[PDB]
Design a protein around this ligand. Structure first.
Ligand code: APC
Ligand code: APC
Ligand code: APC
Ligand code: APC
Ligand code: APC
Ligand code: APC
Ligand code: MN
Ligand code: MN
Ligand code: MN
Ligand code: MN
Ligand code: MN
Ligand code: MN
Lengths: 304, 304, 304, 304, 304, 304
């Protein structure tokens, strides 16, 4: 909805967003939204996501698709009205994204999803990319495990010429919706095939906001390597504008840079990561600040 | 509609447009149009804005969507006829924009929306953009608070990978329409995702006139940073031709340049702004002229 | 229709075309076509113009839209047949342009529309463009007042982020049609937003011929400023091929060059204009020649 | 249809094509096809041409459109079958071009349309183009008059911002079809607006074959001047591949080069033309050989 | 269908493909397939070729179009099922190409179509192209006569601005289909207008296999001369990948190079041709080896 | 489906993937999946593959198309639901790929398909490409025979102007589906014509995963040779991202480099092959390693 502010309320909003990242208990936001989702009326539409054609499919709190749901409106605070209607498995009325309010007046946050090795990590979308020899697949799994902490992480596999990999986009959005509805830490191996159809465009522009709203983190690998400025710029734009955080390789093998948006209008943070391989390519991230706009685009050049 | 002029009536118009900006009491035009809107028959269509597909949705004076409205024509002064009809939630007949006359013979103005720190600010669309380290989000909010003055400003959020952010274009135009119907100072955080569908194109070409006609100001952030001459030029065109005013960052951190179109055929004005950060990234614009066409394009180069 | 010629009849045509610009009394053609339009049967379709979609709308002699008109054919001189039919507000059968014969055998002219400061001006489409500090909006209004002479000029406003400006293309063509049906001197402020849909393309290729046939002049502002060779070349093509005349700014502030097509196969004329500003940006054109094809393209370079 | 040959019959075919240009009486072919067209059953479809949409319209021998014609087939020599069917004014079955046989076994000719100033001119399509100061419009009319000889020439006007000019493509194809059905010498002023829709593409690829089959000549002006390699190459291709002859200006004002395809597999001929202006821009071509492929493309460079 | 191989059966295949070109009696494959076609049930579909839209038309063994044919399946050797159905003149079910097995287990051949002047020529598609003064039209006809030998060659004419030339793509595919069903040596004059619609694309990718399967040769002229890397590369690809053989002009007038693919996985052969002109441009090819991949692309450079 | 992991279960997966290539008995996975397919209920859909349009066709365990199959769902482990439905020959509900579970929790593998000359080869999609004189057709057939070992390899022929070659994309996918359903070693000759329609794009992004899941190897020839960065880059992307393995030619004639993806997140291996020709172009691969990301793109440069 729209929000109204004066100096006082805006100052309070910024203090709260700052806290959502810096001081809140890691993963508390996810716990809170999990509570909101489970308290919802059974059969109630909670999430809509775009399939390949640009049409949207809808899920309930248990990640089951809702095929038919007769028109039902809800008047918001600002006086606006939200309407949801599902027919023959497709959203007839409504919008893409969360169909129920998880945030409230608290918008524009990057809820801390976890703390690891002395650093806090934001929820939302994290894109892992870069050129060079440092492997991305091993990195997303190590990050997924590290941020999962006590919890297991969920893995969504898509578009790789390996066994058991789904290559159908519509099955992919189904997997993603189920993952965000049920887990705090999600790994997506290969955004490459989405990088273009309407659904693909919708996903890139929607996923970060969906995850951040839920308080879950989606770690997605994206390879730039494709000297075709048409696609390469799309990679830089996705990394620049649709990612809540960015994890990119450097000149030194095994070393990565983490760039994190800490909230609406807040400063981006950066820290480095050292890693090493053990048996069968299992990667481990070793354990034992503010970056400017210019520095940010400097890292973006790396992918050219 | 169309207007006829001879030397005398043209001179009066220019004198009137000149006063609408330079001498009228700040915000007086918004108050005047609020009165025109509230005098409209209940349920009467007053605003039509395009959704993603290119179709248009219609609202009444209370920002409520009209789903059905049987054909109804009106003959204007120049003998032209306006016809409005709404079926199944979409305009079957009519045009995008204000569906009632808010201006009359007084057209081509940039009504003063507010006065702050010794400067008059124009209603209409203001694009906040540029390259460098100066933050746009903190700036749009400080501007919103400064121009709101005694009134709260309205914030429309869209397309950011942060908690509670809407990413559905159709919800966005709904928020925008409601905001212009009810508030004088509006902040849109991130036009980035509009910059392309029919609705997006309609928005860019319509918002400035809609706001200027209402007497409200829409302060929208736009980031150029995207070395892709296809989009970067679309940003320069939007900053050049779709904005009533432009606020762009300079070589000096915290410093901004304001460029204002003061009316139809009138000169553009320019002034600088110094700013500083307080706690939690809350920005403050410090308190205590004519610019040629060439100087204008010089500022436009900054975005490359 | 098609016309047949031998050397004698061809020479006669050229002599008449030459006269239609050089010696006919200024504005006489407009008066003549006004008489033809008024002698038409009531309810008779006289003008069809394309809307955004590419479909066309129809008007009668009083600039009122015709919504229903059953099939009706008319056999011309060359034996050809013209058929007009209107159904549900749109032309079902017919063509875009004048639906009645305003010219007869006298085609290929640039009928003198007015005389001012010692120079004859041609009816048709006049594009006011160029780069630099000289302002186009003040110029088009000054030209409109000067060529109006004893008569008021009509102003069509479109696509500018100023108050009361329509931004809907279909309302725009309705405004243009009404203008050409009722006035000799017409100003269009901002052809920018048309420069692309089927209707926009239709307007650019049709308006020049429609105005010239009527004997009215349409003075339209068009800004090249947009370093995107895709659009900048479209601007040069409109100025070169869809304009009866061109008014472009020069190296000296306040000075403009007028380039006029005097008739089919005839030479282009050129003269200069000096201007100055008075109060409230009201511009005045001071009072007190054959140019070749190469000199013409040279001027076209100015827009790059 | 398809034709079968052995050395003897091929040699005879080439001798006959050579004669169709070099020794046949100028204009005899047109006279012969005129005879074939007039002997056709009344109401019989003789010509189909594509309108803007790509659909085709059909005419009878008197240039009147056939709106309904029930399926009717004809078995050719090679055993193939030709079918023509018209419904609601559009060809349901058939092909674009002549619907009746005018040539016979004699195909691949450039029938001499006229002789003037000691040179024979081919029927088919002649494109007049080039850069520089030599005027094209005056040239097509002078050529039209010269080749008309004792007969008047027909003029098709399209796409110019001058009075009485049709700018509707469908009216244009109607004018052209009528012209080819009724006259040996045809002038088309401005192919510019066709240079893109389906009908436009169909016209460029069909007109030369239609005219050559009829034995009439279509003199079309085409301006290259448009530094946009997308369109400029289209101009060179139209001049290179869709023109039976080419008339292009040179370095010397008033002088032109004529390049003529003399038949299938035969050599291209070239000759120069000197011209001068009299009153009101009426051009006169003064009165009192084989060119190679390489030389041909050298002339094509002129348009860049 | 699909074929299975082990070292032995693969060796036999290669020996068989090798003989199909090197030792079989010239034209014996065409005779063999004529026999297969004539043994087909009357009215049975034998060939489907794509028209402009992408749809396909079907012919029987006598080159007559089939308009209606109720579904009829056939199980092949590999267990695959072929189904054919024709409704309202268009294939409702089936595939493009030969609808009956003409080859069997003997696939991947370039059957010798004829022997002339001491050289064996392959059936399939032969593209005659190149730059320079050597004429293609005279060459395709001389080749047609030379390879026809005791038989007349068939000539399919398309897209030239000459008398009696068809310019309708659908008539063209009809002529081609008939020609391949009835003659061994076919000449297509001007593939230029195909070089793009679905039908055009289908033709380029299908004709070579269709001819090679039949045992007939299609000799098609193609002109590169069109400095537009978009089309020029389409010509090099067609010459490289869609042609069974290539005949290209050299630096010396009258001299040509012949490049022949001799079979699947077999080496390409090359030989030169000297030619001279007789009367009326009738060309004569004078009478009285292996080439690597790199040499091949070297010849391909000639077209730039 | 989606899978959850902790450090322990992740390590187990990597160990299994590693083994699936390095130590499992060659071809054992294919045998295992053959057993899964045969234990399926008769009439059960097991594979869906996209046709040209983008629609998909379905096959049962015996490679026979299923035309009608009423809705039928299956709930998986992650709680997800799979639904298959076939109507009028096309999938109404389902996804492309394997419609039954061949892998289970064991995903992300490159199952060893065979061992030859001391090297293990991975199942999945293998692209044979490169520039230079080394021939691809002889190589793919030699690789097919070598990896077939005791078994015959299957050959799918497509898009070559040689006898008996199918050129219809829909027949091609039918051939591929049948091949993967029935054989461990498959050769596709000429992926060239797919390199673009929806089905072609579907095949490129799906075949690798389909083959790997089955444990069969698809060896496909692909020629880069086509200096058109639009296609040449598509060739590099297919080799880089849609290939399980890559076989590319080098600077030395007859020598090839094999680059193998050994499993998800595992290292790529590389070895060289020497070859020689025998009679009739029958190629023989002579008998008697970790490569980095950078070394990989280096090899990719070879195709420019
Ligand atoms: N033990 C080890 N030592 C060094 N590198 C290793 C390794 N085990 C795995 N790797 C690296 O892991 C990397 C990633 O594997 P891949 O499946 O190629 C995903 P990626 O390369 O990160 O992204 P991509 O598939 O989009 O190119 C490879 O570069 C591989 O070399
Ligand atoms: N205390 C502080 N001192 C200096 N800069 C601060 C600051 N607090 C916030 N900022 C700046 O606020 C800026 C804007 O926040 P962001 O959310 O990135 C919007 P933006 O960068 O202006 O536009 P964008 O999101 O389209 O790129 C950041 O660049 C950050 O550096
Ligand atoms: N008193 C004055 N002295 C000098 N210039 C004046 C002036 N009053 C107005 N102008 C000029 O009037 C010009 C035109 O006004 P604008 O609204 O910018 C239309 P334009 O610039 O002609 O075309 P545009 O809006 O497409 O760029 C401005 O450039 C302004 O400098
Ligand atoms: N008396 C004369 N002396 C020299 N040139 C003359 C002339 N009379 C007419 N012309 C030339 O006639 C030419 C053609 O007139 P136009 O209407 O511009 C057709 P064009 O220029 O040939 O093609 P175009 O309209 O596509 O550019 C102009 O260049 C004009 O200068
Ligand atoms: N007696 C002769 N001596 C030399 N050349 C001759 C000739 N008779 C004909 N020619 C050549 O025959 C050639 C071919 O005729 P055209 O109809 O132009 C087909 P092309 O030029 O080979 O291909 P194209 O039409 O696609 O450009 C011409 O270039 C002409 O020079
Ligand atoms: N005995 C032999 N000695 C050397 N090379 C041979 C040979 N027999 C066949 N070849 C080579 O086999 C190669 C491949 O045959 P082609 O049909 O051209 C398929 P390709 O070249 O691999 O891919 P392509 O058709 O996409 O270009 C040819 O380049 C030919 O030189
Ligand atoms: Mn990876
Ligand atoms: Mn921002
Ligand atoms: Mn202006
Ligand atoms: Mn002209
Ligand atoms: Mn030719
Ligand atoms: Mn090959």
């Amino acid at each position: 909805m729209i929000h109204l502010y004066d100096a006082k309320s805006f100052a309070k909003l910024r203090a709260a967003q700052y806290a959502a990242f810096h001081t809140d208990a890691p993963g508390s936001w996810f716990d809170h939204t999990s509570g909101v989702l489970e308290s919802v009326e059974d059969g109630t539409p909670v999430l809509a996501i775009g399939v390949e054609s640009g049409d949207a499919i809808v899920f309930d709190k248990n990640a089951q698709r809702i095929v038919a749901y007769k028109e039902k409106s809800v008047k918001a605070e600002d006086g606006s009205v939200s309407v949801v209607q599902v027919e023959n498995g497709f959203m007839k009325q409504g919008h893409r994204g969360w169909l129920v309010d998880l945030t409230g007046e608290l918008v524009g946050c990057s809820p801390v999803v976890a703390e690891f090795g002395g650093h806090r990590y934001a929820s939302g979308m994290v894109i892992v990319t870069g050129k060079g020899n440092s492997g991305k697949t091993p990195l997303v799994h190590a990050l997924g495990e590290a941020l999962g902490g006590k919890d297991k992480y969920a893995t969504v596999r898509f578009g790789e010429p390996l066994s058991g990999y789904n290559t159908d986009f519509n099955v992919f959005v189904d997997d993603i919706a189920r993952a965000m509805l049920q887990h705090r830490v999600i790994v997506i191996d290969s955004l490459k095939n989405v990088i273009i159809s309407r659904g693909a465009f919708d996903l890139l522009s929607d996923i970060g906001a969906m995850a951040a709203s839920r308080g879950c983190v989606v770690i997605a690998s994206l390879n730039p390597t494709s000297n075709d400025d048409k696609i390469v710029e799309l990679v830089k734009e996705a990394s620049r504008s649709n990612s809540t955080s960015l994890v990119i390789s450097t000149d030194v093998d095994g070393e990565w840079q983490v760039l994190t948006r800490t909230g609406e209008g807040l400063q981006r943070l950066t820290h480095t990561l050292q890693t090493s391989y053990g048996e069968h390519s299992v990667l481990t991230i070793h354990t034992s600040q503010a970056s400017g706009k210019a520095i940010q685009t400097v890292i973006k050049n790396d992918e050219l």
